[PDB]
Amino acid sequence: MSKISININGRELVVSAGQTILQAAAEHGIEIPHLCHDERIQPYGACGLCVVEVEGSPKLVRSCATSVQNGQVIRTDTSRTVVARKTALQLLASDHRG
Amino acid sequence: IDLTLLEPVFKEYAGKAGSIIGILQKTQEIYGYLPLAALQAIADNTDNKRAKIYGIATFYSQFRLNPVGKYVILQCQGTACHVLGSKAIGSAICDELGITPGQTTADGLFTLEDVACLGCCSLAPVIMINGEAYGKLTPTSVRKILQDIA
Amino acid sequence: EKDSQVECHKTTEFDNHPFIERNPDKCVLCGLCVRVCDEVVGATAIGLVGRGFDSVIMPEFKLPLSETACISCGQCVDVCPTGACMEKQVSYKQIPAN
Amino acid sequence: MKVRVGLGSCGIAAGGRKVMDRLAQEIKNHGKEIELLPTGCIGMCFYEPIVDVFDGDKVYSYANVTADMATEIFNSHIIGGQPLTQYIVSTTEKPYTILAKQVRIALRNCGVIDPENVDEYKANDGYKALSKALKEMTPEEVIEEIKVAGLRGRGGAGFPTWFKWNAARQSKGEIKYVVCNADEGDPGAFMDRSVLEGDPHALLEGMAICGYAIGANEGHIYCRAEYPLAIKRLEIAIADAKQRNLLGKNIMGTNFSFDMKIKKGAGAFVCGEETALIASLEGERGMPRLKPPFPAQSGFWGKPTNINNVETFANVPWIMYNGGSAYAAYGTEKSKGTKVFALAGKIKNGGLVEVPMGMSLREVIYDIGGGILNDREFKAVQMGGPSGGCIPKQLLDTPVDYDSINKTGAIMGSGGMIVMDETTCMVDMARFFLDFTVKESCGKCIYCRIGTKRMLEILERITTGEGREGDIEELEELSISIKDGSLCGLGQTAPNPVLTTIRYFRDEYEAHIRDKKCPAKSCKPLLTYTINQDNCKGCTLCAQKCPVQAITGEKKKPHVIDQALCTKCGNCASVCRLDAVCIE
Amino acid sequence: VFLKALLNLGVDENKVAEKTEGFAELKASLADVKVSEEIQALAQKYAKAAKPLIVIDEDTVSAEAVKLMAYAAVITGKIGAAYRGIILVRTKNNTQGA
């Protein structure tokens, strides 16, 4: 009732309250990187690859540990998130042997 | 070793939640360090999920896992005492004792450890020996004081 | 590509468990394995040790996984995103395959 | 006749018991009714052991006293009536010099009151603010007075304390907690220990007032286990206050009840953050969690919790007794009141200082600090601890307040201010601060766990003479990414020394990269020892003192130092009587 | 007059100077325009609205009115993002296709 509808990456999506933005994007086929996320346990917030840009919040919000509201605008491929994920993956690759 | 004292202690603490820290502090106060047998005997009889007590014991910046000498040396490596030349004092201690930080002497009378800050930055550089502080230290002074202790 | 100035800690591990294979070099410290083994299985056969670079996930009291309370359920294997935790081979000679 | 002895964690470092018992022994040897009282450090730890003798209405301080000096004092002044003027630096008519420009609010009772006895605190208008708040005034009025005084958090963030108090009050819950963050892990910062060992009763009164304002009944002090005198005096304080109905059930005949407990921390720097402190208090591994929920909504054991450092709780009774307008009269329009600073480093007069905000930093270093030690030149000043920044000489007139020092790239921190002369290199100091951050990282997120070590490797390469071209660019990009990616404030403020020492001392990095020379002559790899052929005459005195024998030359002829063999130990310049060994 | 009333309510001139061509000439053209009460009320209602939409019927509105509405949306910064803009309904089914 009173459909919780969000706008992510320019598109309009209908979702369910109490979820995470990562779950909603997976439901509607939008790819957001994640490493320390599992829907059956509590969020951890370690990797940082799940950061998205939400209008109204000056800092990056993790889509694995935030709840969907009504009428929020989300961007997942801005330059700031891209360079953050690039830095995190460069730091991860600096210790991985195989 | 003395599991019986570990015993009055664990009896006393079995109740409050979050008592792992206090249990480890009293165990260190009794033994001077944490042997594996004491950690096992604490991980049992009050559970706390044996991996968890070990993980807590390792982190926490203070839980010494090895025996030490009679006198415990705490060189100040804070910013104020490092500015005034803590490195020279540390090199003097390392040369005169033949041990590095984190090690104990062969006869087990001195042990060298690093501390965040003494807090007596007015007397910098500072060292602690068994709760007695020496400040405004030159390498000759620390050499003389360790010969006097020895 | 790797430069020689930075260090990647090379391990000489030996965990001859008949079902579970661990490799600390490929770990990304996402913490999914320890979180699952504690909050779901409840055995807590593994845990974190150390700080900073020295942080490493290893069994209880650094003992082999066979000597601890492990159940060999394989949930830590099934939630790992990299090759650090692997299940052993059912076939005659297992392979990387689709 | 009454005498105070200025024992503390600094008095033990120079004198300590060596004085007091000797004085006590002298009293026992003479039988005169002399009140010998234990008091904390006043703030002039450059003269300790501090001794104060009160001849009538006159106060005499002729400190820097040993056991022989103490016996001389007893035989000359307390019996003969003759002060020893060759040791006096402060009297009643000639007193607070360094203390003349200080407005002491949280440090009002430090060095004055016996911390182990509540009667002296009561005699100094103590627990009157608690009585006023309990008997005359409502908790909403308490939060209003805190807001009117403009109280900001005396930690690194400078958050308005009234906002936290109000948020904790409006939080739903039958049980609430008040936790005092006494765990400050900043090197060079010792305001907490001084306050605890000088006036724990002010901290207890402020915590009780906060508990009445929010409605909490249980208090906690998370003090480090490495401060034994502080925890002993806190135990004495809670015993004395419980025996005087000041804490516990039915405080001063009012229906409000409040109790507190002492928790001994393990000494983790990450526990300075609020959520990590909560995790440590619950007996788990101290690791920051994700906000929201904030501790004011769900903190200790899931209950609402208000967390503030010791200095605000010490300031609260003074503003409650004097009024919020009186505290608002000090400071600036955006930072009202007073702040404590731990002043140390390359300075003449070190110790604990207290200044109103808005004062220029030049006044702090020169007017009260006495200038630079050994009359050298002022070069920099580190503020905010190893997560802070290094303010250069060109910004020496910046007023000390949160926004002004935030504009310079530094932070307030707990109040650790270290003075740096021209003889200390900024590259090595950035390496030192980054090493301290690396050692104290909890290793949860990728950025603080990996990037701090990478930047430490880069700084080590620069300081060992292996710095390559482009290392500054790598440093600044790593610093920006680490600041943007960390979870808690430990990793966010971690690259502050690295960035700031760039922005004001980039040339030194260039001198460390393209020249392999350290201008401050501190990096032993970057040192080069040469012998002036003009100003020394062939004595072979340095070469004999070199077991490396990197010096070659004939007698009565100038000597040449082999740079490929020299291990740069410094013994070949200390024994030089003609001072011809040049360090370049 | 509506445009002038919207301008007098404190629009950001720097952003509309950066993103548009000819803003200064338009501002100079509306320099001597007086504002009525009803226009002021409508301009206030549009200004305090966080996410205002404009629905223009193409059957009964001239093109220059549509241009002026687009100008009003552009100078206030309420265009080019979600839940904010101009909705234009066409006369026929596939007028947009034509």
Ligand code: SF4
């Ligand atoms: S196999 Fe199961 S019980 Fe064993 S470590 Fe993995 S998750 Fe824990």
Ligand code: SF4
């Ligand atoms: S799940 Fe795999 S990658 Fe993640 S922490 Fe455990 S072993 Fe490492």
Ligand code: SF4
């Ligand atoms: S496939 Fe994945 S786990 Fe295996 S070596 Fe490559 S990065 Fe590591």
Ligand code: SF4
């Ligand atoms: S920034 Fe550093 S201290 Fe903070 S959570 Fe991450 S690793 Fe731990």
Ligand code: SF4
């Ligand atoms: S500084 Fe030390 S190693 Fe170098 S030449 Fe002199 S004595 Fe030898």
Ligand code: SF4
């Ligand atoms: S000690 Fe001084 S004067 Fe003597 S040889 Fe060495 S540099 Fe020359």
Ligand code: FES
């Ligand atoms: S998936 Fe790791 S921070 Fe959210």
Ligand code: FES
């Ligand atoms: S930091 Fe070294 S004595 Fe305080």
Ligand code: FES
């Ligand atoms: S004990 Fe030295 S200043 Fe306080």
Ligand SMILES: [Zn+2]
């Ligand atoms: Zn150098």
